[PDB]
Design a protein around this ligand. Structure first.
Ligand SMILES: [Zn+2]
Length: 364
């Protein structure tokens, strides 16, 4: 019983409030109490953030934790460690587990494990159809109760377009997004059209071409509730994506953390920041927009009240040094897996502290 914390001398950025400056942050009882220059109060621990950047906890809305089912490739505990070392305080896990997340029993398991491991907030998703088999519509009502924040069959074989349509009707009544993909243009246009028709929110999880981006942009100016994402690790035409980021058509970064233990792709959580900071060192995006795309943008997509430092919010805070050089290898790698071309290379930009609910959950 001794729990005020002050984060001092940092450079604070919070896009949601349009706050940027040399401020201090006072944290009382798990919540943000005050942002202001020059703070000192009795009975509080001081974190000295001189020379560091202080912003809302990162949120990643595209993670595979392989739990239950494949816990040798990765599991809730390792994933969680990976996420906080990566600056993430909330992650959304996909439902291609075994068994799949199509009933309250699995949802309930993932939350309980999550609370025990203690490190970051794990939000589950439910599948679109039972057993992800493709035929029948799952019970979106009960799965939303249990905690699911979105629905997706994660590749897939959807491709029956009437199913996809029932889903967006139901989703729309429930105020939760459907997540699709993992031919691309045909799919994306279909999704756009069904979204417009039903008024449901669809979120596209993979876009690889200029034409795909232009389609999304089109439906956006029509006021279609459609968003999309890109994995910053991928980014180093593979060149319209970079433009798509420049022009703000791509809403957020997400790693699509995909551990394997021998199409398929790559683990991500630990390198997302030093990867994305490459885009800033190239003047391609400002630092505020980079933080935006890890914080308030993904928060808005899954409709949770996070990714801000508004007074009263939960104290979810990432503190990072954008100039610190490190290497991902056995020494530093907190994944059970090592599948990433970035392995062994020199990264630039590292998280020094991650704070969740006013409590320090990672330290360098
Ligand atoms: Zn995925």
């Amino acid at each position: 019983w001794m729990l005020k914390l002050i984060v001092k001398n940092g450079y604070v950025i919070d896009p949601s409030q349009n706050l940027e400056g040399e401020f201090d942050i006072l944290v009382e009882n798990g919540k943000i109490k005050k942002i202001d220059k020059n703070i000192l109060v009795p009975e509080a621990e001081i974190i000295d953030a001189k020379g560091l950047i202080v912003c809302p906890g990162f949120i990643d809305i595209h993670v595979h934790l392989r739990d239950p089912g494949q816990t040798y490739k990765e599991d809730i505990e390792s994933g969680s460690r990976c996420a906080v070392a990566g600056g993430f305080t909330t992650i959304v896990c996909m439902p291609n587990t075994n068994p799949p997340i199509d009933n309250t029993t699995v949802v309930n398991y993932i939350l309980q494990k999550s609370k025990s491991v203690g490190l970051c907030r794990v939000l589950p998703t439910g599948t679109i159809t039972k057993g992800r088999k493709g035929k029948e519509i799952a019970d979106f009502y009960s799965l939303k109760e249990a905690g699911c924040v979105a629905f997706t069959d994660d590749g897939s074989p959807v491709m029956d377009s009437s199913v996809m349509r029932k889903a967006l009707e139901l989703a729309s009544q429930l105020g939760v997004p459907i997540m699709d993909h993992c031919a691309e243009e045909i799919q994306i246009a279909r999704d756009g059209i069904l979204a417009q028709r039903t008024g449901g929110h669809v979120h596209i999880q993979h876009v690889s071409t200029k034409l795909s981006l232009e389609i999304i942009e089109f439906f956006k100016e029509k006021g279609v509730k459609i968003t999309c994402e890109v994995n910053p690790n991928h980014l180093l035409d593979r060149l319209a994506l970079i433009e798509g980021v420049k022009r703000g058509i791509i809403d957020c970064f997400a790693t699509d953390h995909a551990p394997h233990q021998t199409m398929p792709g790559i683990i991500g959580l630990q390198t997302a920041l030093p990867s994305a900071l490459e885009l800033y060192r190239k003047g391609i995006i400002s630092l505020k927009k980079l933080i935006e795309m890890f914080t308030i943008n993904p928060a808005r997509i899954i409709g949770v009240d996070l990714g801000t430092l508004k007074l009263g919010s939960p104290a979810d805070i990432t503190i990072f040094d954008p100039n610190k050089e490190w290497i991902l290898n056995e020494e530093t790698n907190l994944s059970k897996s090592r599948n990433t071309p970035l392995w062994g290379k020199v990264l630039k930009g590292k998280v020094i502290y991650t704070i969740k609910d006013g409590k320090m959950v990672y330290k360098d």
